[PDB]
Design a protein around this motif. Structure first.
Motif, PDB file in Angstrom:
ATOM      1  N   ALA A   6       0.824  -1.202   0.000  1.00 16.90           N
ATOM      2  CA  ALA A   6       0.000   0.000   0.000  1.00 16.90           C
ATOM      3  C   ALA A   6       0.863   1.257   0.000  1.00 16.90           C
ATOM      4  CB  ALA A   6      -0.935  -0.002   1.200  1.00 16.90           C
ATOM      5  N   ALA A   7       1.877   1.272   0.859  1.00 16.05           N
ATOM      6  CA  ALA A   7       2.777   2.415   0.958  1.00 16.05           C
ATOM      7  C   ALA A   7       3.623   2.558  -0.304  1.00 16.05           C
ATOM      8  CB  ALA A   7       3.670   2.280   2.181  1.00 16.05           C
ATOM      9  N   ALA A   8       4.230   1.456  -0.731  1.00 14.64           N
ATOM     10  CA  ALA A   8       5.066   1.459  -1.925  1.00 14.64           C
ATOM     11  C   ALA A   8       4.323   2.057  -3.114  1.00 14.64           C
ATOM     12  CB  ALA A   8       5.530   0.046  -2.248  1.00 14.64           C
ATOM     13  N   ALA A   9       3.027   1.773  -3.201  1.00 13.60           N
ATOM     14  CA  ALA A   9       2.204   2.285  -4.289  1.00 13.60           C
ATOM     15  C   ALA A   9       2.311   3.803  -4.392  1.00 13.60           C
ATOM     16  CB  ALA A   9       0.754   1.869  -4.095  1.00 13.60           C
ATOM     17  N   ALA A  10       2.281   4.473  -3.244  1.00  9.29           N
ATOM     18  CA  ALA A  10       2.377   5.926  -3.206  1.00  9.29           C
ATOM     19  C   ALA A  10       3.589   6.419  -3.990  1.00  9.29           C
ATOM     20  CB  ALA A  10       2.445   6.412  -1.765  1.00  9.29           C
ATOM     21  N   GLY A  11       3.372   7.419  -4.839  1.00  8.63           N
ATOM     22  CA  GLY A  11       4.456   7.963  -5.636  1.00  8.63           C
ATOM     23  C   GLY A  11       4.378   9.471  -5.768  1.00  8.63           C
ATOM     24  N   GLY A  12       5.418  10.159  -5.307  1.00  7.53           N
ATOM     25  CA  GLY A  12       5.443  11.608  -5.384  1.00  7.53           C
ATOM     26  C   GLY A  12       4.659  12.261  -4.263  1.00  7.53           C
ATOM     27  N   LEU A  13       3.442  12.695  -4.570  1.00  8.69           N
ATOM     28  CA  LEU A  13       2.588  13.343  -3.580  1.00  8.69           C
ATOM     29  C   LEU A  13       2.281  12.396  -2.424  1.00  8.69           C
ATOM     30  CD1 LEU A  13       0.248  14.752  -2.151  1.00  8.69           C
ATOM     31  CD2 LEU A  13       1.543  16.245  -3.684  1.00  8.69           C
ATOM     32  N   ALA A  14       2.596  12.833  -1.209  1.00  8.57           N
ATOM     33  CA  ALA A  14       2.349  12.027  -0.019  1.00  8.57           C
ATOM     34  C   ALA A  14       1.042  12.429   0.655  1.00  8.57           C
ATOM     35  CB  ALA A  14       3.510  12.157   0.956  1.00  8.57           C
TER      36      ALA A  14
END
Length: 87
Positions: A29-37
């Motif tokens: 789930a976290a890894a998916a995040a890219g750029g904008l947090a």
């Protein structure tokens, strides 16, 4: 098996593997995040009441409480006194 007479022994640890998968998912789930947090998690509903009691009574009706107050000289009238006037 145990030795001979088997049949649903129980030993295994399936529950352990289950919980593991749950945690692993979070990682993805976290890894998916890219750029904008952006996490996100608004706390609405199920809020704390005014003065929460551990053993709150479940009564539905009047107050049912003894008071040390009574009526001595309650006001409530529509009339004026226009007698014995001395300007």
């Amino acid at each position: 098996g145990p030795g001979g007479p088997g049949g649903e022994p129980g030993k295994g640890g399936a529950a352990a593997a289950a919980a593991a998968a749950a945690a692993a998912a979070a990682a993805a789930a976290a890894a998916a995040a890219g750029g904008l947090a952006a996490a996100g998690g608004p706390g609405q509903g199920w809020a704390p009441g005014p003065g929460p009691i551990t053993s709150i009574p479940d009564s539905l009706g009047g107050p049912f409480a003894s008071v040390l107050s009574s009526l001595q000289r309650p006001n409530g009238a529509k009339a004026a006194l226009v007698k014995s006037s001395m300007f």
